[PDB]
């Protein structure tokens, strides 16, 4: 995020980091329950990648994080890689997340819910802060 | 990249207005947000765009794609969760 600010630690408890086997953060995701993470299809997750829950500072060795293995990757069958449309994948975890003060789920909308133009929302992540 | 988790608030746009920036690249399963002095950027992909509804944070978008330079005056593009939630529910129910 360019021109954002630091979050209060633990205040976005559904936010996860997707890391490859080298420890490199490559995408975010969101917990929707103890067993499932939503992310983007174009992130290209495989069962060799790791879901990290409960993290704030990727440079800290002292946080009580959960490193969760992925059982199966469910890429939405409507995903179109040419247009990047329907850009959603579900990850089924091999080991359930343990919910706590710093790890819990985001709500999903109904299909008919309306979010009007002009509404102020929030986005979070560990993406670049400058290009 | 930053070690510590970042946040930003930003407004939702309509798809019709987002098309002024991105043209026919904008499809019905996309929602745009930003152009407000902040931007999502590389490495944010897959993470949440949440809006508060009836006191609870609700997943409205998934960070998807936008400007190759993360311009803060151009909207970012997010996967539109309302268009996708029936598939989420079918997948969870079957697995």
């Amino acid at each position: 995020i360019v021109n954002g600010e630091e979050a209060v630690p633990g205040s976005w408890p559904w936010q996860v980091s997707l890391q490859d086997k080298t420890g490199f953060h490559f995408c975010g995701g969101s917990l929707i329950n103890e067993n499932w993470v939503v992310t983007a299809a174009h992130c290209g997750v495989t069962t060799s990648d790791v879901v990290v829950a409960g993290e704030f500072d990727q440079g800290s060795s002292s946080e009580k994080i959960q490193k969760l293995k992925i059982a199966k990757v469910f890429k939405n069958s409507k995903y179109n890689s040419l247009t990047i449309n329907n850009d959603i994948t579900l990850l089924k975890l091999s080991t359930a997340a343990s919910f706590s003060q710093t790890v819990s789920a985001v709500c999903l909308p109904s299909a008919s819910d309306d979010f009007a133009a002009g509404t102020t929302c929030v986005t979070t992540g560990w993406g670049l802060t400058r290009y | 990249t930053p070690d510590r988790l970042q946040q930003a608030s930003l407004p939702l746009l309509s798809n019709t207005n987002c098309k002024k920036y991105w043209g026919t690249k904008i499809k019905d399963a996309m929602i745009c947000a930003g152009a407000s002095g902040v931007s999502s950027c590389m490495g944010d992909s897959g993470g949440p765009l949440v809006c508060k509804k009836n006191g609870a944070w609700t997943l409205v978008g998934i960070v998807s794609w936008g400007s190759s330079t993360c311009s803060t005056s151009t909207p970012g593009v997010y996967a539109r969760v309302t268009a996708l939630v029936n598939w989420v529910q079918q997948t969870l129910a079957a697995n």
């Binding site: 983007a40 174009h42 990047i84 993406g127 | 991105w22 690249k25 999502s40 950027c41 590389m42 490495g43 944010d44 992909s45 960070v63 998807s64 794609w65 936008g66 400007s67 190759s68 970012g76």
Partner: peptide
């Protein structure tokens, strides 16, 4: 454009 670029994936994010």
């Amino acid at each position: 454009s670029w994936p994010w």
